[PDB]
Each structure stands twice: as structure tokens, then as C-alpha cells.
Design a protein around this ligand. Structure first.
Ligand code: MG
Ligand code: MG
Ligand code: MG
Ligand code: MG
Ligand code: MG
Ligand code: MG
Ligand code: MG
Ligand code: MG
Ligand code: MG
Ligand code: MG
Ligand code: MG
Ligand code: MG
Ligand code: MG
Lengths: 143, 60, 262, 62, 206
RNA sequence: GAAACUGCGAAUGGCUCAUUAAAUCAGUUAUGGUUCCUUUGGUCGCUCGUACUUGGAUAACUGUGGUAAUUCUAGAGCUAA
RNA sequence: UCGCACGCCCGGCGGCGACGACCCAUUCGAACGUCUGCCCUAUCAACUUUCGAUGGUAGUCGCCGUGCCUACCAUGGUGACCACGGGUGACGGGGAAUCAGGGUUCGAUUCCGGAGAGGGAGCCUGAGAAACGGCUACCACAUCCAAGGAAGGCAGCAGGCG
């Protein structure tokens, strides 16, 4: 399950090899009343960029979106959907911004269409700046 | 080819013009900062060794 | 720009200095110091526009460099020194003491002070730091690093500093009921009692404060400077005492007082 | 970057219909009754009253 | 020079940013250090804000922490054996952060035999006739001998570590960035990460 | 007190609008992801190991110059931080 | 290290300053980031990708975060909600003109932010520059000369030619 890739995949603040005679894992609460999920504590995964078990700090803005693509490795694309007002025609126009959000692997079952909440953090890659903090399931689909 | 010979134990110096290639080939093809025996410079120059220290060109 | 700017323009200067428009292209870029640039009032502006003790930049230079102006108990000689909030000017020779407190509007007011009040000032702390051997540190609003404070002094409180020593004498804690001078924003200069404190995690915490005449108004917490327990201050208050009478009441007061003057 | 005002304002406005005989006769009546030098001194007073009435109309519709 | 700027590259939409300014000085890159193994050579770069960075260029020693016992000693770097990024950075011996080097286990052997007074390594049958290792292992007082006899219950080591001590050189991970700090520090690999990198090394060995 | 070494500033200002179409820019917040001469406040005998003051060069100055010519500079003497 | 006063224990104690320094704050900032907003064009409908395009893991470089760059994997990323390509007699904004209410046109122009010093590029010094009233090349231009060489950058203020 773990140690897929080239280097050893461990959490950097834990010292796992103290002399004996299950590893403890580092995890934190990210503030703003976000409940850390049970799979973050009970899991066995590693992640640099998970907000709950990694070296990121959720700051700034706390936005939302709908899951619209999950084709990437440990990041999804959300589709922020909003309106915009022209001062001439007292009307609106429906716009959107697709944006790439690092989805931690503690959110283990999510399908596209779910309304996730994201938080601004350190820029994790070129076009990724947010993390999925909590996931709210789409309407219906309880089965 | 003008020469500027300086004796630094008294602190004196003098420009001597000379145009004798027999007096000058003993100076030619030798590098800077070396002590060439100046005995081929005239009647009065015997036992004098001089460190050549580099000068100025035809064009300055 | 390829580095830090050194010039400041006349129009781009802050409005509460109340510079005019047609003397020169520039305004004095204040030197770096304990108070911010847009929240200071420099010594050239204080001696030249307000007090009229100097007429020109040469006159305020020769006043400040025959060593007469004593800011905060210390001799400060450059004319672009940022004299900021709660600073104490000690005019030694002419025998005055000023405290740069704000006005009922956005100004700094010329506010004459007795020497027994002018030997202290009041400072809002900005940080609690812990130095290298468990040594606590206050960081006030005017760059004072004060090592070994009282552990009951926390991050948004104020302290009464003795000036020739720099030591703490007493402190007021940020609670509901205490006073407040407001150092920033649209409510700048107002004086009231702290009615409410509203916590916003991540955002800027906002404090509701109510003055003497029943007017309640909000302000971000970075702009709030408590100045005494209850209604009783630990300094003096300027003329008008931070009320902000309306424009109708100001009109009525000026015509009433000057028709009584005649 | 020079230290001067560059602030200026016209104190009048020329009317849009130039040769309306009723308006010409009325303005020249005012010049004759109050001894004015040209039509601009009629137009500047009409402009000041227009600004006063425009502030009036916006305060009344407030 | 070498630039570090996002404006020379495409958008998220695959577009083309045309630049609005030429190359800046805060957009600066300098070439790689490529710290080999040899007698110590460190050049000093002065950087933004007037500070100093220490390019190692060839480098022999570094202090490694064996942290399950918590002993951290200055040690001679023997070899580079595994690198998670690039195998030619193993093929040439380049010290980088999180590469696997080998270091001679003599200071940790000295510490273990001086703290617990038990031999490690030590193919059995030989005793050092210079006699200093056995004057380290023997002849103590009856007050201190109970201290050694109670510390010698916590004196059994991992067998992977112990055969590394017997071969004489340990596997360790570089923690610092030697093109940045100028040092080649790090920690001795023991544990499941040691077994991970060992099976990586011998699977690469084939 | 000219000169010259040292220190600082010369990255501010001023001019123009060629480039540049989510670029710049405006509001907005973030640096818990960084640097910062200066100025104000701390710190500045915390270290356990010739001091009544250590060394040798160099400019300015004198003196031989070179080039047609540069805010060019060379060989020699001295002398400070 | 430097300058003023000049006293006191019986050689040693001394006050007021000036300068400089590792770090921590402070000030002026700078620098990347977050959300949202730009005119015309479909006679521009698909564009981007092993020459980085979108992510992952490990490094290199950097002041820092970061495909910024390298190595190995994943095959993604943007698009009728107008991308991509082109055009602009396009620096952006505060703002100006015209106006009943809406609008339409302008903003090179004194305040703020950006860009640049003929065109491109590279750097030294410095806390801060990819500086040009600093340097090195090349291209175009161009000055002095003993023909070997030397020196330059008005979109700074005047001024001259076109
Ligand atoms: Mg409309
Ligand atoms: Mg400028
Ligand atoms: Mg064009
Ligand atoms: Mg243009
Ligand atoms: Mg403009
Ligand atoms: Mg134009
Ligand atoms: Mg400008
Ligand atoms: Mg420039
Ligand atoms: Mg030109
Ligand atoms: Mg340039
Ligand atoms: Mg010029
Ligand atoms: Mg310039
Ligand atoms: Mg001018």
C-alpha cells in the first residue's frame, strides 16, 4: 500500500525507529472549525500536501466548488460557478473558473459533482493553491 | 629606445636614450621582473645587474 | 523602482497632516522610525505648520539642530523624524510639553501637557516574544522591545511607560468597560467604552465601542488603543474629548459661540 | 511635476438654439434694463441660477 | 543568466505569455554545485540580502546522527550508493539531499563499546593485542559495574545494523543540502526505511 | 586647510509610453512561504581559553616618463587608518 | 577606533557622546501569491504535450513557495460560460468631455503602479540594479587620429536637424 515510489515515504516529524523492548502518525486540526476526518487519524497514508497530515497551513480564503474532474494524481479540479453584473444591462452572465485543487487521500470516496470546500494555502505546484478541507455529498446519491 | 634607469638605494633615476642594438639585444627577448646583467650598456656599466620592470610602447 | 523611494509628493502625502497644495511639489518624506509613515506627523510639519515657531525648512533645521526639541525624553535632531501617536514633545527652552494625541476629527492636536504627566506615555503592545533564555518581550506600537514584562500583560493591552527609564509602571487590559482612543479608520480620534468584542478567526476581529453620548460604532481591533479602566483615562483628553458632534451640531456650535462672541 | 493648480471652470453656457428671436429680445431687454456689457453677463447669471436650481431639484427629490 | 521565472512559460490554458519586462536580478539561477567526494573544497557565494551560501564542491566528512541510540559523530563519507532521483548521480558520486551514502562505522563502534561495553562487529576469535578495546570492556568498579550491568539489557541492536558494523560501513541518508549549507550532514538509516533502501539497492544490483 | 585613501550616495529624482490584453493595473487579502542599508528599541564580562595597543603595504607629496590623443597611466622613493 | 570637558581614590577609578557590529524586533519597503474585473475579431474552433503542457515523488538552483530546472512515473490541462490565434491610431488606474435617466467617447500628460534608456544579451559593486548621466560583447549608427589606436548613447534641461 505504502512505499510505491523511489524514496522512502514517511512523515518528517515522526521518529519511527526507537528501540523496542503500529507507528504514531502526525496530524493536526487546521482551524476554522474543520473537523479532521477519521481516516486521517486511522489511515496509513503519507502526504506532504494534505492539510491534516502534512506541511501546509490553511490561511487566507475558504472557498467552495463542485468536483468536475478527478483524472489527476491526488488533485482534482473544482468548478467555481458565479454570476457577473454589467452596469449597462441590469442583468447578469453566468461565468465559471475551473481551478485545480489538491485533494488529500484521506477523502477516500468522492465522485464528481460533490460540493467540496477548499482553503488557500502555500502554492503546492504551478497552478494549484488550495486544499480540499471538507466534502459535502451531492444531492441524492446516498446509496 | 629610451631607458629609465633607477637606483633605489639612493632614490635617484634618469632617462638615457640609446640606439645601439648591440647594447639592446642583451635586454631583448627577456621577461619582466628579471635581473639582466647590464654590462653591455657602456664603458661605465660593469658589474651592474638591473631588474627590468617593464615600460611603455611606441604608442604609449 | 530599483530600490527604496526617498522622495514624497505634496499631493500624495497623508491628509491628516493638512498640507496645502501650492507651496511646493514635495512634502517631507519622514525618516524611518518607530511609527508608520502614513500614521506619523513629522517634526518639520509639527514645528512649521502647527505651532508656527518656524517659517521655513532652514528655520526648522536650525531649531532642531541647536538641540532644543526633545521627543519622548530623548534628543531627536533630524527634522523628518516621525513623531507619532502618544509621543511627548519636550520643548525645554520655551517650556512646553506636547502629547501627539488625535483630535475629534482625524488630526493630531496640539495638546499642552504638564511635566508630571509628560514624564510618562502610554503604549499599546503589539507582540509577546520570548527571547533566548525564556526572557519575555513586549513589542509596543512604537518599536519598543521591553524585556522582562509582567506576565499578566497580553497582546492587545496598553502599558504606562516611564520615559527616562523605559520601564513599565502600570497597565490596562483589553476588557469590556475600559476606555479607547481609536487609532485608525473612519472613526479615527473617537473616545468610548468597549461595548463588544467579536471574534473572527482569520479575519480581522472587530470591536464595538460606545462613546459618552450614546453613539455606538465598530472598528477593527488594530485601530483601538485603550486608555484607562472604566471611563477614567490615564492621560488627558483634547478639546472636545473625542465625541464627533455631527455637522449640524458643529454648525450650531460655531454660530452659537460666535454670535455670543459678536 | 510642477506645483500649481490647473483648476478652472466656465461660468456660463451658450444656449443651444442661437437665433431664437424671443430669447434674443429678452436677453437684450435685460442688458438694457441693467446696463450689461454683452450677452455673456446674461448667460453667466442664468448659469449660476441653473446650478442653484439643480442643487435645489436634487435636494427636493431627496 | 539562468532564470527562475514563471513568465517564460505557458499558462494553465496552454497559452503563450509574452513578456513585459526583461530578466531581473531576483529571477536568478546559478549552476549546480554537484558536490563530489574528496578533500574539502567550499566556495562562498554572496546572495540576495548580502548573506552567504556555501557551495561544497568536493567533500569528505560530515556528522551523522544514529538516532535510535542518539549518538551523532563526525564521520568520513565512503561512497554514494543510492539516489532516489537519478541513477547517474549514483554512477558519479554526487552528495545531494536525501541520497544514500556510506560512512565508516568506527566512531559508532567506539561509542557502543564504550557505553554498553559489549563488542559489535568483531568476528569472534580475534582480540586486539593493543589491548585498549579490552581495557575499555573490562576492569571497572563495583559501583559502576551495576550501572553497566543494567545498561547492558538495552544493548541489543538490529541485526541489519550489526552486519553493517561487521562489514565496517553503514548506510546513511544525507539530510542537509550541501550546495546550500556547505555540509554533508544526515542520519544513519535503521529500521523499515533501512530495509526499504536495502531491497532497493539489491534489486538494482540484480 | 587644498590633495588623496576611507565611509556614504550615485538603485532617488526627471523624461517618454515602444513593449504589454488576466499581462500590467484596481479593489482585496496572504507571506504560518521570503529578503531588507537605514532609522527607533532591545541586545552587545552569559563562552572557562604586546594588551600601557601587533604586522606590512598603498594613494596624496617629490622625482624620471611614454602616446598624436582619453577623467590613459608606468617604473622608483616615502607615509597614515 | 575617534571627540569633548577634566574630576575622584592612596598607579587605579571615572561622566557625556561619535562610529561600527552577529542576531531579534521596528520603519521604508521590495518580492512572489488568493478572489474578481479588460476593447475589436470565428474571413481564428480547437489549442497545449515526451523541446514542460497539467499533476506526483526525490533532488538542483533560488532570498523564499513553486515544473523554476533536472530524473523517473501519471496523461493530464484549457475550450461555445468564446479558450487558442490575430488586431489595437492599447501602458493600467485615480480621472476628462458630453449629458434628463441610462449611456457614448477619451485618459501619452504633472498622483499611484508598470515598462525602457537606439535594438537585443550578459554581468561587477552593493542591503537594494540585470543600473546604461556603470561595464563588456554583437547589430545599426556615429566622433577624433600621426591609420597604431581612442571614445560614445538627450524618451534629463535648454538647444539643433529630420
Ligand atoms: Mg443600465
Ligand atoms: Mg524614478
Ligand atoms: Mg498597434
Ligand atoms: Mg502602444
Ligand atoms: Mg494614463
Ligand atoms: Mg501615442
Ligand atoms: Mg509615473
Ligand atoms: Mg530600468
Ligand atoms: Mg532616441
Ligand atoms: Mg541596460
Ligand atoms: Mg543621458
Ligand atoms: Mg537614472
Ligand atoms: Mg524640469
Amino acid at each position: 500500500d505504502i512505499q510505491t515510489e523511489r524514496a522512502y515515504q514517511k512523515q518528517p516529524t515522526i521518529f519511527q525507529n526507537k528501540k523496542r523492548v503500529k507507528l504514531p502518525r502526525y496530524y493536526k486540526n487546521i482551524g476554522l472549525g474543520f473537523k479532521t476526518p477519521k481516516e486521517a487519524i486511522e489511515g496509513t497514508y503519507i502526504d506532504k500536501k494534505c492539510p491534516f497530515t502534512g506541511n501546509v497551513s490553511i490561511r487566507g480564503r475558504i472557498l467552495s466548488g463542485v468536483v468536475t474532474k478527478m483524472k489527476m494524481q491526488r488533485t482534482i479540479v473544482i468548478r467555481r460557478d458565479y454570476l457577473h453584473y454589467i452596469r449597462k444591462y441590469n442583468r447578469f452572465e453566468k461565468r465559471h473558473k475551473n481551478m485545480s485543487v489538491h485533494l488529500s487521500p484521506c477523502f477516500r470516496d468522492v465522485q464528481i459533482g460533490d460540493i467540496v470546500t477548499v482553503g488557500e494555502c502555500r502554492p503546492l505546484s504551478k497552478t494549484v493553491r488550495f486544499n480540499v478541507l471538507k466534502v459535502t455529498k451531492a444531492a441524492g446519491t446516498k446509496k | 629606445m629610451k631607458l629609465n634607469i633607477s637606483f633605489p638605494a639612493t632614490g635617484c633615476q634618469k632617462l638615457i636614450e640609446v640606439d645601439d642594438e648591440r647594447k639592446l639585444r642583451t635586454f631583448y627577448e627577456k621577461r619582466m621582473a628579471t635581473e639582466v646583467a647590464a654590462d653591455a650598456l657602456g664603458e661605465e656599466w660593469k658589474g651592474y645587474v638591473v631588474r627590468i620592470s617593464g615600460g611603455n610602447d611606441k604608442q604609449g | 523602482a530599483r530600490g527604496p523611494k526617498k522622495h514624497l509628493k505634496r499631493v500624495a502625502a497623508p491628509k491628516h497632516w493638512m498640507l496645502d497644495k501650492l507651496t511646493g511639489v514635495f512634502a517631507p518624506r519622514p525618516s524611518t522610525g518607530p511609527h508608520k509613515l502614513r500614521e506619523c506627523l513629522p517634526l518639520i510639519i509639527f514645528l512649521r505648520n502647527r505651532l508656527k515657531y518656524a517659517l521655513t525648512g532652514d528655520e526648522v533645521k536650525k531649531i532642531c539642530m541647536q538641540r532644543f526639541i526633545k521627543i519622548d525624553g530623548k534628543v531627536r535632531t533630524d527634522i523628518t523624524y516621525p513623531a507619532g501617536f502618544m509621543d511627548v514633545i519636550s520643548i525645554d527652552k520655551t517650556g512646553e510639553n506636547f502629547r501627539l494625541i488625535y483630535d475629534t476629527k482625524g488630526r493630531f492636536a496640539v495638546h499642552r501637557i504638564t511635566p508630571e504627566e509628560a514624564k510618562y506615555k502610554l503604549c499599546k503592545v503589539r507582540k509577546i516574544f520570548v527571547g533566548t533564555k525564556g526572557i519575555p518581550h513586549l513589542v509596543t506600537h512604537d518599536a519598543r522591545t521591553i524585556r522582562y514584562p509582567d506576565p499578566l500583560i497580553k497582546v492587545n493591552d496598553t502599558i504606562q511607560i516611564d520615559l527616562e527609564t523605559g520601564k513599565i509602571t502600570d497597565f490596562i487590559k483589553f476588557d469590556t468597560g475600559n476606555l479607547c482612543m481609536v487609532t485608525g479608520g473612519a472613526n479615527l480620534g473617537r473616545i468610548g467604552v468597549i461595548t463588544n468584542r467579536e471574534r473572527h478567526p482569520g479575519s480581522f476581529d472587530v470591536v464595538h465601542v460606545k462613546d459618552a453620548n450614546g453613539n455606538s460604532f465598530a472598528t477593527r481591533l488594530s485601530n483601538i488603543f485603550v486608555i484607562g479602566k472604566g471611563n477614567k483615562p490615564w492621560i488627558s483628553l483634547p478639546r472636545g474629548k473625542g465625541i464627533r458632534l455631527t455637522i449640524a451640531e458643529e454648525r450650531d456650535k460655531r454660530l452659537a459661540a460666535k454670535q455670543s462672541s459678536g | 511635476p510642477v506645483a500649481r493648480s490647473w483648476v478652472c471652470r466656465k461660468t456660463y453656457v451658450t444656449p443651444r438654439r442661437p437665433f431664437e428671436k424671443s430669447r434674443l429680445d429678452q436677453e437684450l431687454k435685460l442688458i438694457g434694463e441693467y446696463g450689461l456689457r454683452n450677452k455673456r453677463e446674461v448667460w453667466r447669471v442664468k448659469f449660476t441660477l441653473a446650478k442653484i436650481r439643480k442643487a435645489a431639484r436634487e435636494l427636493l427629490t431627496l | 543568466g539562468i532564470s527562475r521565472d514563471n513568465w517564460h512559460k505557458r499558462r494553465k490554458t496552454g497559452g503563450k505569455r509574452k513578456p513585459y519586462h526583461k530578466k531581473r536580478k531576483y529571477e536568478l539561477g546559478r549552476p549546480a554545485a554537484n558536490t563530489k567526494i574528496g578533500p574539502r573544497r567550499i566556495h562562498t557565494v554572496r546572495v540576495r540580502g548580502g548573506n552567504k551560501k556555501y557551495r561544497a564542491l568536493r567533500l569528505d566528512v560530515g556528522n551523522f546522527s544514529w538516532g535510535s541510540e542518539c549518538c551523532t559523530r563526525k564521520t568520513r563519507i565512503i561512497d554514494v550508493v543510492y539516489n532516489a532521483s537519478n541513477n547517474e548521480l549514483v554512477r558519479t558520486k554526487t552528495l545531494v539531499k536525501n541520497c544514500i551514502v556510506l560512512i565508516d562505522s568506527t566512531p559508532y563502534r567506539q561509542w557502543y563499546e564504550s557505553h554498553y561495553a559489549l563488542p559489535l562487529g568483531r568476528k569472534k576469535g580475534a582480540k586486539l593485542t593493543p589491548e585498549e578495546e579490552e581495557i575499555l570492556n573490562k576492569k571497572r568498579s563495583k559501583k559502576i559495574q551495576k550501572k553497566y550491568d543494567e545498561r547492558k539489557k538495552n544493548a541489543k541492536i538490529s541485526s541489519l545494523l550489526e552486519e553493517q558494523f561487521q562489514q565496517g560501513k553503514l548506510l546513511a541518508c544525507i539530510a542537509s543540502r550541501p550546495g546550500q549549507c556547505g555540509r554533508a550532514d544526515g542520519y544513519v538509516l535503521e529500521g523499515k526505511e533501512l530495509e526499504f533502501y536495502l531491497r532497493k539497492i539489491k534489486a538494482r544490483k540484480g
